[PDB]
């Protein structure tokens, strides 16, 4: 009732007072991180069978 509405409006007010970065910048660092660790992904680039623990 009254308590539920008060809690909801307080939560919405708290959520609305946050700082958000631009979407393009978030995409930029997401792509940068995804590209930086490209070589440490055996799943992406198949690993040579010499060092494949699950050979089978």
């Amino acid at each position: 009732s009254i308590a539920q509405a008060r809690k909801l409006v307080e939560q919405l007010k708290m959520e609305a007072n946050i700082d958000r970065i631009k979407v393009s910048k978030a995409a930029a660092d997401l792509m940068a991180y995804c590209e930086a660790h490209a070589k440490e992904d055996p799943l992406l680039t198949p690993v040579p069978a010499s060092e494949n623990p699950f050979r089978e």
Partner: peptide, 16 residues
């Protein structure tokens, strides 16, 4: 695809 998803996971570098 018309069926639902039951699990979601990422790779080490986040590309897959």
């Amino acid at each position: 695809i018309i069926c639902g998803i039951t699990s979601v996971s990422f790779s080490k570098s986040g590309r897959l």
